[PDB]
């Protein structure tokens, strides 16, 4: 306030919002993937040999949304303290965006056998850490403005 500090401030909420809707969708997608893996049941009749009909629709769509939310935060500026914070969440986002995008080539193309090979879990816990680090440091810029 007294210029400076407001647009700087709204830009920090703007970033810690859609990093949050970047993440949330990446957790929704890892539900909606398993919703198919397990719904490839000893039923087989409801002839969707793997395929979309409802829950793979939802796990390519829910992901595409994550990937759009991230863009409005990474085409947005690292307020300089945010250098090794953003620069980590990108590397992270690029580990776990990919790990998901493979479970689709797996789950529309029947391939369970590879679907359970990769630590989808390790690639998420590690991003849960980076995410935390950007919050613990973003707050620390602001645990200076109050």
Swiss-Prot record:
S-S pairs: none
Entry coiled-coil feature ranges: none
Locations listed in the record: Cell inner membrane
Segments on the Periplasmic face: 2-146
Region (The 3 Arg may form a positively charged pocket, which binds the alpha-carboxyl group of the attractant AA): 30-39
Domain of life: Bacteria
Family designation: Belongs to the methyl-accepting chemotaxis (MCP) protein family.
Described purpose of this protein according to its UniProt entry: Receptor for the attractant L-aspartate and related amino and dicarboxylic acids. Tar mediates taxis away from the repellents cobalt and nickel. Unlike in E.coli tar, it does not mediate maltose taxis. Chemotactic-signal transducers respond to changes in the concentration of attractants and repellents in the environment, transduce a signal from the outside to the inside of the cell, and facilitate sensory adaptation through the variation of the level of methylation. Attractants increase the level of methylation while repellents decrease the level of methylation, the methyl groups are added by the methyltransferase CheR and removed by the methylesterase CheB.
UniProt protein name: Methyl-accepting chemotaxis protein II
Source species of the chain: Salmonella typhimurium (strain LT2 / SGSC1412 / ATCC 700720)
Portion of the parent chain present: 36 to 180 of 553
């Amino acid at each position: 306030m007294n210029q400076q500090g407001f647009v700087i401030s709204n830009e920090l909420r703007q970033q810690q919002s859609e990093l949050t809707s970047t993440w949330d969708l990446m957790l929704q997608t890892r539900i909606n993937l398993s919703r198919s893996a397990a719904r490839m049941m000893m039923d087989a009749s409801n002839q969707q040999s793997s395929a979309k009909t409802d829950l793979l629709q939802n796990a390519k769509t829910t992901l595409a949304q994550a990937a759009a939310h991230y863009a409005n935060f990474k085409n947005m500026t690292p307020l300089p303290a945010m250098a090794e914070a953003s620069a980590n969440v990108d590397e992270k986002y690029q580990r776990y965006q990919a790990a998901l995008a493979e479970l689709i080539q797996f789950l529309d193309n029947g391939n369970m056998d590879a679907y359970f090979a990769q630590p989808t879990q390790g690639m998420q816990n590690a991003l849960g850490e980076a995410l935390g680090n950007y919050a613990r440091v973003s707050e620390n810029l602001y645990r200076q403005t109050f």
